[PDB]
Design a protein around this nucleic acid. Structure first.
Lengths: 212, 116, 118, 46, 121
RNA sequence: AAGGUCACGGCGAGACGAGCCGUUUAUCAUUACGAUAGGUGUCAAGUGGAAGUGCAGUGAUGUAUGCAGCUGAGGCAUCCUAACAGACCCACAGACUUGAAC
RNA sequence: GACAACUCUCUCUAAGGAACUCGGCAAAAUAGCCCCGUAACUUCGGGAGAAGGGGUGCCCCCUCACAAAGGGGGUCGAAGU
RNA sequence: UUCACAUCGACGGGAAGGUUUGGCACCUCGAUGUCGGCUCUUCGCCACCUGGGGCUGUAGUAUGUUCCAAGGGUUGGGCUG
RNA sequence: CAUUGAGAGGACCUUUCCCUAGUACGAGAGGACCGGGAAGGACGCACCUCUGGUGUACCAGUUAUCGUGCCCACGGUAAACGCUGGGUAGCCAAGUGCGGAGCGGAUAACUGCUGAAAGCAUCUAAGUAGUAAGCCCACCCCAAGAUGAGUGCUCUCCUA
């Protein structure tokens, strides 16, 4: 349950905003490829919960299959790629018919949370996944960087599940929390936000207000 | 991880890879059409586009860098007398990567380089 | 009247440098110059701090086009970084020029300090 | 490292048939390439 | 970055020359001592006309460092040596004349070091 | 059939499978989509003054051309090259039984 | 082909410098020729290349045992066995 | 200072645990590789700290002892294998 | 495609300094509980805007030598850079941001409120209140192979 509808935007590099007091803050720059049109609302009557379903990245019709574009043309909106809802408490007033919601709702709310696919690092070891220590690099040692002991002795007879092994590190989404908003641009369709979003410039990014 | 490392390294070390690039683009400029593997094909594509457009502006500095890159002496001087008369107005894209059957003994994906 | 692409690094950075140039003019600091920095720090009431020194590098990334500066204070070896587009500076003055054959004077840190006193 | 016992006919016919089914998957690709190698304007196979 | 086996020069005329600093107080990191962190120094060598001899545990203040110093104004200050001031726990040192320049953020906790300093940058 | 898979051009994804983004009269015009990768043209950016010539010097070398010359893993533009040619899987109201109204 | 973990053979590493460790193990550092200078001790043979410090590339000139070599000067590089 | 039970508690008594040294020799010697260190767990509470409380010979700070509570933490070093 | 979430993981940690206030208390000396703020430490999730390490894409200086006929200028080699000087994009931290919230639920120890079995009493036998870093929920992610296999929207089943 979220405390309100959010938007989604793409990361476009990082820079530094110079505050007129004299400080230098590192900000991430957020663009918006297409407006976050509310496509499908799911209320308490026809569904077990209440959520507002928006989308993103208007595309060519060849890029989008028949169930997708049939679902989007059921709402009478543009064919678009990305599609996510926000679960919201039952006080909502949202029509699914082409609500091109403008981005003014976050500037006075100087706290926002963001979610995104972090950059994947592939099958990485235990020295960087779970912040282990390496063995002795010298003094006749042989267990350089290795995983060390894995379990206890005879009495378990196995290893505990969830034990810290090497595996695929990045690729899942994360949410970093309470990130204070900064100078929006009402003509450059760009929002400064002081922090570090998950991922390189180009990826999708959930931008939804806080849950404290 | 290889995020954004756009060098195309082969199954050979660095200086041997440089010699493979120079020799195979040299004999590519000698015969025109050539049989490579596909990694060697794209690795020829970047450098031989650099060597067609290098002696496109036939000065002395371009001719000396171009003679420094290519092995054979008499093929650089057969190049700038040929590339403005042929590959003017093309503005990039000097090759073609026509693929063929894999190689007997390796199942190596084998390609074939033109000049067009 | 044109909509803009995903090339917003250059136009946010370009209009940021153009706004900071509209506020105060700045002549360019090449590597090897001997310059002055006049800094605004509150509550000191002198409002013009003295920073003489030799620019070592210029790590120019748009709005962080910066100065690696060096002056031997009477103890030893002070190496200060300056953002040229910050509102905390007041003016720059290119006093001299060493005419050095290098873009990065990181050798000059640990040399003999008679060749580093501004 | 040294195997404690041996495998059955069961598990071995499973693993060998996964190996040969992995050989099955790389010939409908060869049927597609052999079918595109036939009469048609394709910019490959000089 | 001041490890617990570093040599710091003296920034005053208290009576020492350098010191092996031992195991910082305050910030419990103790493998990264930035500015303003007091250190439990021991005297490696000293001036032999002063009641500060060899092998004497004392408390001092890191006032210069080769590691950088991130400021909010955009500047980054760094020195070429490491320096400490032989300090007492009630503020002021027992050496008056401070050698070398210091920064100005440590004025908010150590004002006597700034007031006795030749340059405050 | 809808939708996938192979192939194809790759990736900020990745041991292999995966995943993701393309797969072309690859806009036309009044204002967000139909540039995937390489090349090319420019712009950030790195090293930092290239060759050749002239001048000064007995010569090492310095100087003008000339923030020039190379690099261009990054941004934008450009269809010049390769995205051609295909192939294959999945089809044909979704068993049997009760209740409701039509 | 690809450019995962991890082993091995190498290169570099901000700040510190043995805090690691059974133990400076291993790596890093010194390194060639000339000049200055060199202690405790001793079987007076040595230690000793003790330690420690300076020059070193390339172009000029002259002194020239008229082959090695010397001094003075300039020239570049961050760095000259 | 009075005062067995704020706190220790002599002379004695009753238990729990299986973490020391022991007793037996019950599995294992056609092989269950001891002590310390590195790496990496996880668990117990007989609680060192953190959270709540009682009593205090607790004026306050700091305590002494004790109840609930094992979520989390429990340093860097000189000596020695 | 879009999610609910049964179940499971991670995170729920901790210290000084300041106001209250040199106030209660104490002859003085000393010096609060409670409620806020600020700076840290470890841990974790990210990122490369700054500062760097590396960066065998790179460019620059130079030694020995072999080629390019020769001077210039280049190329090869001195392992898997000849040795150095810097560096874009990646990766990383020492760097940069963020997190650890809850007059939410029930409790353990305890303090209670009425209050009887013994017309006195007693936290309890009926009912009930404050309250723990502990339990659960909320917090971030995976998640219907949850065979109990969910829910919602949309596309397609044609010819003989």
């Amino acid at each position: 349950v979220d405390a309100g509808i959010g938007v989604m935007g793409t990361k476009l590099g990082m820079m530094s905003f110079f505050e007129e007091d004299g400080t230098v803050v590192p900000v991430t720059v957020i663009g918006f490829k297409e407006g976050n049109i509310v496509t499908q609302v799911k209320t308490e009557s026809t569904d077990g919960y209440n959520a507002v379903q928006v989308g993103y990245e208007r595309l060519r019709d060849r890029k989008l299959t028949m169930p997708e574009r049939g679902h989007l043309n059921k709402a009478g909106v543009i064919p678009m790629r990305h599609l996510q809802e926000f679960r919201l408490v039952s006080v909502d007033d949202f029509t699914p018919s082409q609500k091109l919601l403008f981005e003014e709702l976050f500037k006075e709310g100087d706290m926002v949370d963001i979610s995104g696919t972090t950059i994947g690092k592939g099958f990485q070891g235990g020295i960087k996944r779970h912040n282990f220590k390496r063995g002795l690099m010298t003094h006749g040692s042989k267990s350089h960087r290795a995983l060390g002991s894995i379990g206890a002795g005879t009495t378990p007879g196995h290893v505990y599940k969830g034990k810290k092994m090497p595996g695929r590190m990045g690729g899942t989404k994360t949410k970093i929390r309470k990130l204070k908003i900064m100078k929006i641009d009402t003509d450059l369709r760009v929002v400064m936000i002081k922090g570090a979003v998950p991922g390189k410039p180009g990826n999708l990014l959930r931008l939804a207000p806080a849950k404290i | 991880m290889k995020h954004g490392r756009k060098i195309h390294r082969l199954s050979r070390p660095a200086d041997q890879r440089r010699a493979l690039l120079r020799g195979l683009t040299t004999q590519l400029l000698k015969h025109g059409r050539i049989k490579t593997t596909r990694a060697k094909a794209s690795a020829m594509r970047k450098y031989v586009d650099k060597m067609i457009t290098l002696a496109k502006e036939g000065s002395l500095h371009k001719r000396r860098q171009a003679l420094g890159f290519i092995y054979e002496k008499q093929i650089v001087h057969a190049l700038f007398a040929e590339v403005p008369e042929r590959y003017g107005d093309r503005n990039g894209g000097y090759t073609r990567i026509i693929r063929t059957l894999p190689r007997r003994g390796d199942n190596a994906p084998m390609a074939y380089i033109e000049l067009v | 009247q044109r909509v803009k692409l995903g090339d917003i690094m250059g136009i946010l950075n370009k209009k940021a440098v153009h706004a900071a140039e509209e506020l105060r003019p700045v002549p360019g600091i090449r590597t090897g110059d001997i310059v002055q920095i006049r800094l605004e720090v509150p509550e000191n009431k002198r409002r013009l701090s003295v920073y003489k020194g030799i620019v070592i590098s210029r790590q120019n990334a748009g709005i962080h086009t910066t100065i690696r500066i060096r002056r031997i204070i009477a103890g030893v070896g002070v190496e200060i970084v300056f953002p040229l587009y910050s509102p905390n500076i007041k003016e720059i003055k290119v006093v001299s020029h060493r005419k050095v054959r290098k873009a990065r004077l990181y050798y000059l840190r640990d040399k003999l300090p008679r060749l580093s006193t501004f | 490292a040294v195997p404690k016992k041996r495998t059955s006919i069961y598990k071995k016919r499973i693993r060998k048939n996964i190996w040969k089914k992995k050989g099955y998957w790389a010939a409908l690709k060869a049927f597609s390439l052999a079918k595109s190698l036939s009469t048609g304007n394709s910019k490959s196979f000089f | 970055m001041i490890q617990p086996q570093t040599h710091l020069n003296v920034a005053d005329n208290s009576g020492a020359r350098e010191l092996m600093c031992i195991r910082i107080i305050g910030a419990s990191n103790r493998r990264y001592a930035r500015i303003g962190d007091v250190i439990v120094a021991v005297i490696k060598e000293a001036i032999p006309n002063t009641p500060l001899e060899r092998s004497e545990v004392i408390r001092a203040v890191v006032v210069r460092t080769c590691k950088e110093l991130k400021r909010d104004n955009g500047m980054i200050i760094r020195y070429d040596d490491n320096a400490a001031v032989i300090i007492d726990q009630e503020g002021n040192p027992k050496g008056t004349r401070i050698f070398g320049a210091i920064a100005r953020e440590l004025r908010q906790k150590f004002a006597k070091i700034v007031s006795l300093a030749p340059e405050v940058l």
